Each structure stands twice: as structure tokens, then as C-alpha cells.
């Protein structure tokens, strides 16, 4: 996040040192600066790379999900936690193979009457319950699971500033894997083809669990719908192994492609 070096003045040359010539076969990039190939003046550099630090690049709340609940089973909804339901944050994360950070979740809740001239309801309160992989998932908008004696819940009152909570680095590995070239199972010799088969590039069937959202108020016959837009921001970021960015449209959770396979336009070789 710092300063750039100054440009030193450089005069003419006539020597056996040729920085302009190189050999990219080695796998290295030629570290030339302007003064290597032209005469330069002294410039005191004041520009910095403060905004391109790994932290500043991700320091934005991106939408990862839009959970919908109809307060007239739709009285409650469950969202399997992921960053792949949307494309924008996903593409930025995928510039790297591994990552490690904390997360900040902000929830923007909106609601409205479906009918322009019918129904009425008192102010709604929402419960956003996190169900860690293993915990019982709600079957009804009002069954015993909503007691949350151990699961973390967030109760949001409609109209209040967006709710917000922080989550630590929760991975079971030392870093989050954006790419996993493997399987969760190894098919063994002799077992039925139905056996030992698993998805390519998938780890746990339930990585991070899911969110169960519901309106706590008793539902009125009035037609109402609410949407909880989930925004996530990685804070305290560290990333490893850069990768080229996604060039063609995403086709699922994997690196699969199908449709926009011809991303580049035509342009004449000798056309400026």
C-alpha cells in the first residue's frame, strides 16, 4: 500500500549492456523501467498503491443472496450458505486459489403489500437463524428448532438500520479453497458403480450450513412478501496463488462452461 520509486534522469548510452534484449523462455518478466530504453528526467513520484492492496480490493459489501419469505410452507425459507449464487464477488475471489479472512454480513430487509388495495399488518420482526451443519433444520415456521438455545440468531425489526454481524475464519483447513481438484470419495475396485461416486471439485456435502429466515409475527390473511438481501465483506484478508480471471460465463458451482465461449470481438491486426 505504498510509494512508487522516483524516475531518475537518464542520459544516452553506447554500451555492451543490453537490458532491452531478453529471453522470456526462462519464465521471468523483464524488469525494465523507462530509463532503460529512453532518456528520462528526474521525477519525484508521489503516487501510491494504497487502493490496490488485497484488503482495499475486497473492502466492499457485495450481494451474495436474496432470500424471500411470503408471510402469505413459505412462511419460512432456508438458504444454503455460498458465495457462488452471485457472480461479482465470486469472480473477484477467484483471482486467487486460497484465502483466509473474517466476514461481515449486513442484511437489507424490504417488504410490501402484494395488493394495492387490500390487507394490513403491524410491523414485522424477522428471525435469521444460522443452522451449522448437523443442527436440526426447521420443518415449520414455528417448530421447536426456532428456540435457538445454541444456534446464533438475529432478530431484525422492520425499518431499523440493516442488521450486521461478524464471523471469524471458520474453515476446517488452514485456508479457504476457491478451487479443489479432487473428490470427497475414492471409488474402490469391486464396488458397484453407484458406490464411491461423488462430485468433482466438491468437498463436504454441507460446507458451511445454511440460514433459516422467518417472520415471527402471526401471519394475517393479507398477502405480503419480504426479501432479505445478504451482503458480505471479507475483512482482515490474506490470499494465495493468483489465477487468471473468469473470461466466459459461469455455468454452475464448478469451472464448467457452455455458453459465452467467444468473449473477444474482432479487430484488424493493423487497425489502431
Amino acid at each position: 500500500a505504498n510509494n512508487l520509486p522516483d524516475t531518475q534522469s537518464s542520459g544516452p548510452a553506447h554500451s555492451k549492456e543490453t537490458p532491452a534484449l531478453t529471453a522470456v523462455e526462462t519464465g521471468a518478466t523483464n524488469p525494465l523501467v523507462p530509463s532503460d530504453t529512453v532518456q528520462t528526467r528526474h521525477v519525484i513520484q508521489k503516487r501510491t498503491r494504497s487502493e490496490s492492496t488485497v484488503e482495499s480490493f475486497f473492502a466492499r459489501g457485495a450481494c451474495v443472496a436474496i432470500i424471500e419469505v411470503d408471510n402469505d410452507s413459505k412462511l419460512f425459507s432456508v438458504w444454503k450458505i455460498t458465495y457462488k449464487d452471485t457472480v461479482q464477488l465470486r469472480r473477484k475471489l477467484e483471482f486467487f486459489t486460497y484465502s483466509r479472512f473474517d466476514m461481515e454480513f449486513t442484511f437489507v430487509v424490504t417488504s410490501n403489500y402484494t395488493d394495492a388495495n387490500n390487507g394490513h399488518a403491524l410491523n414485522q420482526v424477522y428471525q435469521i437463524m444460522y443452522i451449522p451443519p448437523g443442527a436440526p433444520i426447521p420443518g415449520k415456521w414455528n417448530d421447536y428448532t426456532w428456540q435457538t438455545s445454541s444456534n446464533p440468531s438475529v432478530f431484525y425489526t422492520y425499518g431499523a438500520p440493516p442488521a450486521r454481524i461478524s464471523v471469524p475464519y471458520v474453515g476446517i483447513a488452514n485456508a479457504y479453497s476457491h478451487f479443489y481438484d479432487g473428490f470427497a470419495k475414492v471409488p474402490l475396485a469391486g464396488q458397484a458403480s453407484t458406490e464411491g461416486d461423488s462430485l468433482y471439485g466438491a468437498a463436504s456435502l454441507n460446507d458451511f450450513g445454511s440460514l433459516a429466515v422467518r417472520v415471527v409475527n402471526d401471519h394475517n390473511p393479507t398477502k405480503l412478501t419480504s426479501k432479505i438481501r445478504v451482503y458480505m465483506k471479507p475483512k482482515h484478508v490474506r490470499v494465495w496463488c493468483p489465477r487468471p480471471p473468469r473470461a466466459v460465463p459461469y455455468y454452475g458451482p464448478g469451472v464448467d462452461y457452455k455458453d459465452g465461449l467467444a468473449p473477444l470481438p474482432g479487430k484488424g491486426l493493423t487497425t489502431y
Binding site: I131, P132, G134, P136, Y144, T145, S150, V170
Partner: peptide, 12 residues
């Protein structure tokens, strides 16, 4: 780690 709810107790 990661406290969660058990499936070993329910309430109808």
C-alpha cells in the same frame, strides 16, 4: 468448536 443445536432432543 462451533456451538450448534443437537438433533437428540425435540419438542412436538
Amino acid at each position: 468448536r462451533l456451538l450448534r443445536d443437537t438433533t437428540h432432543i425435540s419438542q412436538e
